[PDB]
Amino acid sequence: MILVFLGPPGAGKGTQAKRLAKEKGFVHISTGDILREAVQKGTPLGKKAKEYMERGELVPDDLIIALIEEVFPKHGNVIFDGFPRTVKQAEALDEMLEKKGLKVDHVLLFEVPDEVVIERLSGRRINPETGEVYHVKYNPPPPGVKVIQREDDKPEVIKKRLEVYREQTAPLIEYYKKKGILRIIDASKPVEEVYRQVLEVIG
Ligand SMILES: Nc1ncnc2c1ncn2[C@@H]1O[C@H](COP(=O)(O)OP(=O)(O)OP(=O)(O)OP(=O)(O)OP(=O)(O)OC[C@H]2O[C@@H](n3cnc4c(N)ncnc43)[C@H](O)[C@@H]2O)[C@@H](O)[C@H]1O
Ligand SMILES: [Zn+2]
Ligand SMILES: [Zn+2]
Ligand SMILES: [Zn+2]
Ligand SMILES: [Zn+2]
């Protein structure tokens, strides 16, 4: 099965994907996570991506498309999270899959308002040891667990990331609505309620 999670920065795509991964064996592909690790390691890929990620801009389609080619899991059910972000990326993904006689089964649009985006990301905390994701209010790290705030969760960068999302996702939504595989979910609900909508759409 191939799933795509679409949604604003902070919608909880990673949170949901990481739960399907551990509970139903899905292979979770988060282009943001993969790029962040490259940047941290200072590989050629990380050097190339750093400038965009720092400013809350999209990494160019050509680099992302090549990346997805390289990281595509050969086996297993896959969740693409934060990919595609443009129609060009979605077309490349649809072609890659078609060559394999696969398709995208479902596109889940995680809808939240801007206010909630800002709330979710500004309060987002990561255990740097494991990459586990917490939220200062909604899902705090337990006592004793040291956490950091991502540099790109700073207010100016969140705002740019949100802007780029609201602009670029419009044609992508249309693209998948045309195929009849898009399902909206209210991602403004608690994590458990969101997970349930997810399972409902895919089951
Ligand atoms: N394909 C692509 N093309 C071009 N560039 C690309 C690209 N992919 C990546 N990039 C580049 O890389 C950058 C980063 O990309 P990426 O990492 O993909 O950023 P994003 O999708 O905009 O958003 P997030 O990773 O921040 O949010 P999320 O939806 O996964 O929410 P999370 O589960 O963490 O949850 C957020 C917070 O909310 C909490 N939370 C989650 N759900 C709930 C809930 N239901 N209720 C209360 N709190 C919740 C969490 O604990 C957490 O604190 C981009 O800006 C771009 O530069
Ligand atoms: Zn994420
Ligand atoms: Zn073809
Ligand atoms: Zn703009
Ligand atoms: Zn199905």
From Swiss-Prot:
It catalyses: AMP + ATP = 2 ADP. Residues 123-153 are annotated as: LID. Pathway: Purine metabolism; AMP biosynthesis via salvage pathway; AMP from ADP: step 1/1. GO terms for cellular component: cytoplasm; cytosol. SUPFAM superfamilies: Microbial and mitochondrial ADK, insert 'zinc finger' domain, P-loop containing nucleoside triphosphate hydrolases. AMP binds at T31, E57, L58, V59, G82, F83, P84, R85, Q89, R161. Residues 30-59 are annotated as: NMP. Keywords: ATP-binding, Cytoplasm, Kinase, Nucleotide biosynthesis, Nucleotide-binding, Transferase. GO terms for biological process: AMP salvage; nucleoside diphosphate metabolic process; nucleoside monophosphate metabolic process. InterPro entries: Adenyl_kin_sub (IPR006259), Adenylat/UMP-CMP_kin (IPR000850), Adenylat_kinase_CS (IPR033690), ADK_active_lid_dom_sf (IPR036193), P-loop_NTPase (IPR027417). ATP binds at G10, A11, G12, K13, G14, T15, R120, R124, V133, Y134, K189. Its EC number is 2.7.4.3. Gene3D superfamilies: P-loop containing nucleotide triphosphate hydrolases (3.40.50.300). GO terms for molecular function: adenylate kinase activity; ATP binding; nucleoside diphosphate kinase activity. It comes from the Bacteria. The keyword Kinase applies. PANTHER family: NUCLEOTIDE KINASE. Consists of three domains, a large central CORE domain and two small peripheral domains, NMPbind and LID, which undergo movements during catalysis. The LID domain closes over the site of phosphoryl transfer upon ATP binding. Assembling and dissambling the active center during each catalytic cycle provides an effective means to prevent ATP hydrolysis. Monomer. Belongs to the adenylate kinase family. HAMAP family: Adenylate_kinase_Adk (MF_00235). This is Adenylate kinase. It comes from Aquifex aeolicus (strain VF5). The lineage of its organism: Bacteria, Pseudomonadati, Aquificota, Aquificia, Aquificales. The gene is adk.
